[PDB]
């Protein structure tokens, strides 16, 4: 529920050590997962921001940690990263010059209309 | 529930249906013709 | 010679053409139209019920 919500600060791992019925070995691989999620969201989040502002929220603070997950993201180098990829995708709605695809369903609407009349 | 005349059901395929099919093919032809003709009256 | 009218109209022209060639006598084409007087129109319209370039009667007529 917390991960879905978008919280990475009331997520808990302490409540998974209350059972020690071999739930205790799953936490090991769920301290990976919390990290993964913060990192994806940050790709969407920034059109571009400073390296300094973004590392403290990753909870990375050593360049090695930055590199490791950066590969998965597609981000290039360690302190340097391109958060920008995800933001870039929104902008193409601006075009109008090529009509055929942009208008859409030009063939479809015409065909049915012709049958009806 | 189950259909009443099982001899009529087994027999019918060969009997009524086979014969009918020819009569139906004309009926199809009359359907396309009406359309063409309908569009022709419009001209 | 195209898909429309089978008629071309020409007027003789003399024009200088250069590529190593001298002045040529040629026929220069001028574009043609269709048109008729009332007598002609009457017989063709009653007789016609063909498909034409377009008749006009539907949207679908227009695609042809």
From Swiss-Prot, chain B:
Entry-annotated residues carrying Phosphoserine: 1
Source taxon at top rank: Eukaryota
Membrane-spanning residues: none
Subcellular localization, as worded in the UniProt entry: Cytoplasm; Nucleus
Summary of the function given for this chain in its UniProt record: Component of the 26S proteasome, a multiprotein complex involved in the ATP-dependent degradation of ubiquitinated proteins. This complex plays a key role in the maintenance of protein homeostasis by removing misfolded or damaged proteins, which could impair cellular functions, and by removing proteins whose functions are no longer required. Therefore, the proteasome participates in numerous cellular processes, including cell cycle progression, apoptosis, or DNA damage repair.
Known partners and oligomeric status: Component of the 19S proteasome regulatory particle complex. The 26S proteasome consists of a 20S core particle (CP) and two 19S regulatory subunits (RP). The regulatory particle is made of a lid composed of 9 subunits, a base containing 6 ATPases including PSMC4 and few additional components. Interacts with NR1I3. Interacts with PAAF1. Interacts with TRIM5. Interacts with ZFAND1.
Similarity remark: Belongs to the AAA ATPase family.
Descriptive protein name: 26S proteasome regulatory subunit 6B
Organism expressing this protein natively: Rattus norvegicus (Rat)
């Amino acid at each position: 529920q917390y991960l879905m919500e978008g919280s990475y600060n009331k997520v808990f791992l302490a409540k998974g050590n209350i059972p020690a019925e071999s739930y205790t070995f799953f936490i090991d691989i769920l301290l990976d997962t919390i990290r993964d999620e913060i990192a994806g969201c940050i790709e969407k989040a920034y059109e571009k921001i400073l390296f300094a502002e973004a590392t403290r929220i990753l909870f990375f603070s050593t360049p090695k940690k930055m590199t490791d997950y950066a590969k998965k993201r597609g981000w290039l180098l360690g302190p340097n990263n391109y958060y920008s990829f995800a933001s870039q995708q929104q902008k193409p709605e601006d075009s109008t010059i090529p009509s055929t695809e942009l208008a859409r369903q030009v063939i479809e609407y015409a065909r049915q209309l012709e049958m009806i009349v | 529930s189950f259909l009443g005349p099982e001899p009529e059901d087994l027999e019918d395929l060969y009997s009524r249906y086979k014969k009918l099919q020819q009569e139906l093919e004309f009926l199809e032809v009359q359907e396309e013709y009406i359309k063409d003709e309908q569009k022709n009256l419009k001209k | 010679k195209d898909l429309g009218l089978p008629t071309e109209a020409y007027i003789s022209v003399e024009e200088v053409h250069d590529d190593g060639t001298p002045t040529s006598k040629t026929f220069e084409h001028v574009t043609s139209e269709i048109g008729a007087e009332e007598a002609e129109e009457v017989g063709v319209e009653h007789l016609l019920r063909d498909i034409k370039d377009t008749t006009v009667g539907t949207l679908s007529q227009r695609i042809t």
